[model samples]
Target: PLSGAPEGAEYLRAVLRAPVYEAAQVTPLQKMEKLSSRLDNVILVKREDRQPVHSFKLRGAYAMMAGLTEEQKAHGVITASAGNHAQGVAFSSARLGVKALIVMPTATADIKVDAVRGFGGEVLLHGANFDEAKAKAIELSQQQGFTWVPPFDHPMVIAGQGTLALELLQQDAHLDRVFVPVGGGGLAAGVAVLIKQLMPQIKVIAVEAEDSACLKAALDAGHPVDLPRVGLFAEGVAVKRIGDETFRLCQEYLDDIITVDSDAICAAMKDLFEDVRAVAEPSGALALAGMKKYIALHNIRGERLAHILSGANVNFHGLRYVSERCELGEQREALLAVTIPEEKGSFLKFCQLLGGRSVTEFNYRFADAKNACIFVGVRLSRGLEERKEILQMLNDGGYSVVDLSDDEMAKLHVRYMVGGRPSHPLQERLYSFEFPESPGALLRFLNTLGTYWNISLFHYRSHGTDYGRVLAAFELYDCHDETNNPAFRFFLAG
Candidate 1:
């Protein structure tokens, strides 16, 4: 076996060769018209989400497993993953009639847990993140004498991922560039190396979430380096370090590496939905987000570009959060703090100045009556340029305004903090809840409360556990009926 980084014609030939797709598929290459027109480029999405396991992960997993000897398969296989890779290993194991033990972080969403079980994997929930879970996996491998099937970093796995790029070239040789989302960099490494080997002129860009840019750090450091911490929004790619082999490959072959934020990733999901009417998980949209940001940054007018949608393993209620932030992510929502003179009809006058466009949110409270500051959210129907016009219109009217649209603190904290504590004359009850972090759990929690109880304040942040914590302030008119209902207490306990 080659001890160091594998390269040259033989490695490239390994990728070009056919793969054993016993548990994977050639997902569609879809044209994204809306995104293409908006970005002024020919944007195509490689639909890896259409794989049997609903991710590109199975390709590498199956390829690596296919190369294992009969004895190795009999000994059983083990691995650690956040979500997609775990599912890949499980699917591969079930198909090959091999026993598979999967170690995943407790932070992995419940949908992934159920998916691994569906594929006949014995699961152990360990640690808070991928690296910690990986440590346990290595320990278990040695103790139990199980063959460790790495998520990435293996030569077989790297060659397996390269098959996707081979398919891309066969499908469209005219492609100017391709954007690949990177985590441990298996997909990017395989794709970049193979593409450069065959067609060195075609650009191969590695895309990553800003919070977990292990590939970028590794490229800068000249070797794999551990990240301090990784954000869990895109849990599939929340790896703290890129694989050594994958890093070496990307550092040598990839044209560029780009990092995007959570908001941009959410916006890319929205963009994909507009074209195909389907939702992508945060990590799945990472490539598209990076492509859009790159186009905007360089002001590139025209080019044939493609990006891979790596997975589709999002939670059900996670859609609510994505929808909430997508508008701002796309610069289609402008949040402003507008100060107006305190008067009987001043609010009406401001509304008139806002024109026919819809107001997404408005927060108002009386503070001594001399002047009032309005926290408002306005929709920009005509895209980013229209937001500028609205801002100019507000300024033209001699209104004091602060554009909170681009402010991170304003969007996450200030918007919720606007009202701050209930001061209403009616009864306000503040309740904290510990709800199971499962598909539709949040929606189910909200549905149980019902609309009858006026919601004064609500806050929810995913901690990536079996249970999620929620805080709510409710003003109820019929306390006697709710207090007597056994269901309320049952749900509260849950």
Candidate 2:
């Protein structure tokens, strides 16, 4: 409904004629045999990761660039991005013989900055975060008279993304539902409009990272609104706000939207790797994660389902975090904190109570003369049901237990931090902090907080994200026992 924005018919026409092939390939729509059998559905995935830039972004970038007027092409183009879109624009610009300048946050990964440069774009690192970098790019665009090729907000970009829908329909027209990942909403908007226009009976569902569900927020608020913060796990789709034109199209065309957590996205990544040997980045697996949740929630079976593997530009170190969390995500592992007698035979007795279930992990330290606390991981054959049964068995056997499978602190910090009890009774307050993952960030955090409190505990790990997570404890007076925090009761509390 914006003045010059395309309507349904216009979008279809644009998609039909877009020259995406100038820089993008028609990726395969391969059947997911293992997942199909497990979910009891005909599951297929469009491999958009096979693009020259290893992302579907190139299609939109090329479409927009190819349609630029001769004068506009002569003026060149520019964009602000720290991930896939920057490479897309850079690669497309090379193919079209147009110069491109990509503005990226100063804190962006070296690998990503190098990737844009490798694609023949001039890289300008500016500002500390995406918003600041984007502002700089806009100002530069105006000052230099360069065309600003927006990542996902333009009509040609949306139409170019719609080309994926055309390919999907041609590959398999009988799909019961198609799941699309939504960041700024170009992909979902384009796919939804084209799909609904051509195949009204087929459902076009948009999937979002739960922490970055801008479209869902917009839907709830009846207009686009900025999210205060978004998680960095799925950084590819970590958009703070949905685009206006994209929101309008997605709102009118999408059949539904599903939001999935980081754990689910990790599990989907594992699923993709196991089933197809394709390593998908978190956001790339987002739509598949939502599709899995949808099928389970509705108990739908025997219907054809499809999702796009949107990108595969995974940071190698991030796989460690994914591998650690995926088991819990799939409900195949349960983490528990249990209290047992400190006597010699107690450990064996507790193990027997598990009924010979596989113990994935166990961590313990001598606590006191009478009682001991242990952190344990149990492999589950029947997912949540088995986890519950194990909990009941522990309770029936008179062991104090806490299910820590869903606890963020327990998973990210407490699991590895499980160590000996404090030497003596001391007052401490545990807190988690997230800060930018640039040089001196940790020193900055310490500088701000260390002067105020006697630091009692500290733990940090790099997940290869743009942000860093720290679990710290300060000597402070506090307690509310009934809250039942496993980390406190198991290890920290005196």
Candidate 3:
């Protein structure tokens, strides 16, 4: 996705449009003035979330299925999916009245699995992951003589998915940029084709979630290389690798490609729901999340641009988890492991210390021995200054705190087990450092790494870990620099 590129328009049209639904539910384009105002871009959204199967997959799957000959249709169809594509294929197969065997990884959401079966397609529980399930589907396709349906990479599939471009063009003829989510590159490639053919001047921005950015790895390698793993959080768009056909198309039409973390995806979903009353799955929200980077890279505010909400078939449970994590994901929540005396009044003292900070939840667990362990989750108003103020108050109060917002143990299971005792720190340091939430943040951290003294340890996680703690081995980078930074001495002292 890094290299905004890929193949031509006719190729996309050849694969994605089907004769069954002459319209194929291309969706509509809406003004994203609210989103545009935030990022300073004239934002518009192509609401693909409003679809029959709750996604844009129906366009390509139906188009591809309907294109097959009656004899080919008799062979049945086989495909593998973790999210949207599965529903698309299942719904498309049912519409065509043809048997479709879908091999879905057991890891797929319960809601997605039900959607697949709900469409009358036989569900085959396969390998633990998408790759394993994909392999099993291929094996069954060959052994059973079923026609294998490619999610993307096929000329027809990509073209069918590209139909979204038509909706944008017809609705917002004055588009300046477009955001698209990349997986197997079907949607991206198809949209790229249409953009290249119809609006060559408009930029095409390719987006993906960081954990499952197959397109980023491919661009880094200068070719498609399978990723070792993927984040199932955005299962709808998370891909391990791009297809050869899609790789070629992506290399051609795309302008810029970027990947975001699941937290930002959730944040975007929250924005969508709050501002528009729209519910988008993590993958569906990626394009909007990616705009965070696009606006920074190019000063495109004040000009009209487009973002696509690919689908909204998220599991109901997943949304709750996302909502919990977004605060930390966006650095608005802070969790700390504090060293307080295992005395009876430690809990009361800690609560009193948090004067202005909103206590989302207060929790403490006592130790079997003398002192106990305590972890507190406090919500800080949005902005770096508020967080720093609350943290400074805690530190000045002689309490030690460490952010545990993103730590897997903290967000998932740690918060629950806090009923135990508190522990004391023998000799430790408290550190507060800047963290960039997106890829740009990583870049800034890298540039400042050598800019500062050696780090004893640095850690961050996308959980309830809050403000993220930095425990750096103490060292003075420069005598003059240390003199200027009073906090450096304070950190070294306490």
Candidate 4:
């Protein structure tokens, strides 16, 4: 009775009837060695990224679709979501020989919307967020007599997700706590119930982005309360409130809840990419980020932990952005609302004082001297601590440092953080170069250009495996410069 678990363990069993889970890899609990090296307690990861949609949403979708009576299957299904659940439903329904109509928020990214349509799911763009879209979807489903598959609230879907925890307990057995991301709370709700039923002693930890923590907010208020505003950028966990069933289940099962910054999301994404060479969107990395925070704050290491890699339907372009922002998140890079006088020597002087820190960005826009914005990034060895030293160095040199590291302007819109005169006449020249795989291979090629051109846009990503192509853009100060270049003939001409 102390556990307060549901009377019927049978509900969770019925959820296992969903065919997808039967064939799924049961998802190995990887040790996440790269991450474990950085944390105190040994960290283990439940690799739901290996699922059909590369997310745990498949489990819930399968449960919901499978629970429908034969009569409902003939009627087909419809739901609203712009994320993994949409694809999961689409894939599940298609396999079940049932049509699925997905209505996603109109504000969703093109890639997400397009992915839905690509999966043979009829996509209807509606509302501005999931709740709005859900309302529209419910209306359409009732009007057209279509079976509706709920994202998180339904008992069947909840049990399906809970099955993930059952699998975790059976496999790891040593895990003391499990950290899972909470969006609409489907995954967390379901997993919480299953673990409570099957492994009552195992702890359940739920993570959510600081701005979109629906269950925590509801728990704090002692009842469901809609968040005044949620950070829509996280997308997957951007729900304004938790479902009633989820709040109840969480109250009955979860330990103290935790919220992590969005920057942690980026840092986790970077960690995942650096170690596994895989990309994780903001929501996808939420669990890892929370686990890191928990390890640091609660000293939860040494005790076994299992973290959920919830979803992976992020925009490809988002990876480039996450890579850049992650430095700031992990404190490896600092964004200073840094300002200096607009003089020819001014920029050069600041660059000289930067020490060994690399300049990742340099942007200035046309604006008043008093109100102008300037954006610059300095690679930091120890995040805010090194940031302090950089600020002192700049201030000692008579530059004004208005620390915009935490500025919403800097994170949301970069243009608002810089002041520079636009150069429309800036011509761009692009070239392809191939070089042998060796140390300083890039520099050896750069020397080929000699003094003919100044560096313009330059960036490199090393593929750890073997040979990889690197792209660099330069301005042709002299069109005839490369004619006499030796590296071009010997290295590139090949």
Candidate 5:
């Protein structure tokens, strides 16, 4: 633990006395009926999403702010965030009658910026990314004498988050394991420490997004280390580094750590919706995904398991990506690249081979007279084993096949670009770009790049995020061999 960091007993006392209830609510612990039946386990979800700010962030923010001295409260507070924390601080500031300034990246979505504003926070749009925005916030706080409220690093904040664990214990004393999502480690640290100190038998596992598993990284390194980059799908938990104090507590208290991918997170979101009619953001469903993965890996059954539904601030348009990826995440859909003869009746033959299984999708284009490379999605009933069976069945039938279900590039780009290979072989380079989403952004990209190179192929889709993704091919580029890409080699390569 850090030299001056509060001890376990101190945290327990603080959590017990936290004034979070002044602004935060006691969220319900609801049973997931569908998931429970499927997994044959008692699955409970602590709905932190029910908090006033649609997230548990408000608890910590309000707890920290409520502890401020009169003079400090009079001077107001400041924070750097583009997500739930910003709204949490803003709402707390309004309740406490203190001015609040929130620094957000210029690329922050308009909806989020408006949300902070609606909560009475003065929004400062600065910098191109989160790091820069945070740096500016720190500088302003120092110069202006404004108290800076960290998102997930402070002892008081951790104690406030720990209050949720107190509620969980009160609601369900029979839980065998509790899966808490880890970002910078505040919530996980708090929950693990509180739970372990209170009920040593109830296992506390920390769950994290694989792309942003700072707690795991810190544990492996024996100290905190910055990650080069993190995936944005679970932006709410996309912290590059774990907090020192939070890391210390988690390392000492947590029983195990589990990391899950974006697809699993998407699947968990679908599960939450189907079971409880609750829409969860990717980060919100991360713990549930990890818990589900854990149950499958250990073949555990009949034990009561709980996970926190940390937030529900979903981008309305991001649901498109979720809906598209959920089936794959659930192992209910398989994507494959198959080589079939170009002659007539090949399509019927392929369908016959599927044995009446539903074809979720199929894409193909004429490339050669001898063989055809086709992109296909097949419905699966038995999950991973069934996917393997399908692969084996196709290979046994003398058809060349490559499973693209787990291929990132295939699912994100190649599926849409199948049959788009050039007529003649040409030197071309493919690049994926993420640019701020705004009106005319695509036109601006085209105008800027078209002036220099002949645009060969371009694919863009809006997932209702702060940024847009584009996969484009430009003639005469050599950063990497395009043929190395499985998706491109099978479909788009010339």
Candidate 6:
């Protein structure tokens, strides 16, 4: 009962017969020109983001509501969502003149709440995550006699999402691979049934966030099991378990599953922006991220690859964090740690070794002794090879080095905690600075200052905005006259 309806060949026919045009359109199958040129493949995006509700969920939500009896509509409909599902049910219910109640997690962004309300649904904030919100919705359904509109586990909903695949085939029949983002497996199962049945030559791939890959776990275990933890960054797809019917369909249809991390999703978002001038929420960008990894992993080329651009309903503030990590996600930036001698001119020598290469960031604290550790970031135009050349240069200069690029702790929290108490009083002063966030902006700041003053403390964190905040302390080396020190007085007044 929790899984909703079962599916088979008969189900596929019903999916074909499902009515979606009443609320959803046949979204375009457009080529990603820039991405295609970069990858040497025919990369395409199924613009499901073009739907009236700006998501593929509208098709399924409306179709499911249409299947309900008059009695069910009279009783009203209720469902759970982090965002997309709530909007779909709200839109469908408002158009059908049915009372709708949506229960969403407290963590769901305000943008989603505004959207659902705009569509005329009653809103309830409950629990901390989707699973908890879903439980609340189900309990209310039983008590209030409201119809439970599921997010992805129903036959009608599956068929509706599958309609996109039908539209895709009619748009371009030469596709070799189709990537679908998987949350609870509804979209993947629906699309898989259509593509694999009609075009067996077309490979169906399921993409998921590595932190919440419930479908992959179900396939591995041969049953749906709850994940211990799920990443909250991509909250739309941070499902703990796969739907039962959806899992069965996936077992029969999907050819492969690819899981990527948060950084990759941010990179995919950037890639989409560059190629199509569109912004997709983290879960929405999973398929493209998976596609990028699949091409690199298998060295695939010249194939017609398509991915569903599922939704673009991202919080306006979230773009700040997305932009910060996008460069690292695409392998365009590298993070390093170097050990430099405290001897005179040693810092300058190390800077000379860095040469004219762009620096993304630099962090150093005052240490009274012989040597100090420097946390650095540099720009890489190509891939890991460019990082290799930079590291080689550092090693050749007789410096000890450590690469913190792949260190999760280093990137998330450790970098902010690296600074300590200053040991020298020659010139330690704390100052706050603001700058536009972008690749090499930090490096530019460092370069403009030269290696004359010692950077005693450094801290920075991205807040998902155009501007960045920095708190740093610097020490003026050769100045004994505090009153006459030009840099000190100038900085103090400014």
Using alpha carbons, what is the TM-score of model 6?
0.75
Q: Name the lDDT value of residue 391 in candidate 5.
A: 93
Question: What Cα-based lDDT does every candidate model obtain?
Answer: 0.78, 0.84, 0.71, 0.70, 0.84, 0.81
Alpha-carbon TM-score of each model against the true structure: 0.74, 0.73, 0.70, 0.71, 0.73, 0.75
- Residue by residue across 320-356, what tens digits does model 1's lDDT show? 8998786445675688988877554555567667755
Q: In model 4, what lDDT does residue 310 have?
A: 73
lDDT of 5 by residue, 1-494 (tens): 12258888888888888888888999999999999999999999999988889999988888888888898888889999989899999999988889999999999889889999998899999999988999999999899989999888898888889999999999999999999988898899889888977998999999999999888999999999999988888978989999998999998999999999898898899999999999899999999999999999999899999999999998899998899876444576688988887655565467567765555555564556577676777767798899999999999998899899999898777776665676777677777666665544444444444445544544554533367565666566112334346887677877
Error of 2 at 131 (Å): 2.2
* lDDT-superior candidate, 2 or 6: 2
Candidates 2 and 4 compared: the better one by TM-score is 2
Clashes of 4: 9
Q: What TM-score number comes out for model 2?
A: 0.73
Q: Assess candidate 4 and give its TM-score to the true structure.
A: 0.71
| Cα lDDT tens digits for candidate 3, 223-309 | 999899888788776677898878888877788898888778888899888766889988888998898777877665677878888
The TM-score leader among the candidates is: 6
Quote the lDDT for 152 in model 1.
85
- Alpha-carbon RMSD of each model: 8.7, 11.2, 13.9, 8.9, 10.6, 6.3
Runs in model 6 deviating more than 4 A are: 1-9, 105-109, 127-132, 296-299, 316-326, 329-366, 369-419, 424-494
RMSD of 3: 13.9
Residue 350 error, candidate 4, Å: 13
What tens-digit string does per-residue lDDT give for candidate 2 at 1-494? Answer: 12357779989989998999888999999999999999999999999989989999999999999998898899999999978999999999999999999999998889889989999999999998888999999999899978999889888899999999999999998989999999999999999989988998999899999999999999999999999998888878888999999999998999989999888898899999999899899999999999999999999999999999999999899898899876444676688988877655565567656654555555655446577777777767798888888888889889899899888788778877675466576666667777766544444554555345544444455432477566555565122222225866686666
Q: What is the per-residue lDDT of model 6 for residues 1-494, given as tens digits with 9 covering 90 to 100?
A: 11255545656686777777877888888899999999999999998889878889988888889888899999999998757888899989887889999998888778778889998899999998767998999999999999999888887888888889989998999999999999998899889987876888999999999999999999999999999998989867978999988998898999999999898999899999989888888988999999999999999999999999999888788998998686444576677888887654555567667766655556667565778787877767887998888888888878899998778777767766665545544455666677766554554455555666665565555432466566666655112223334554453322
Q: Pairing residues by index, what is the TM-score of model 5?
A: 0.73
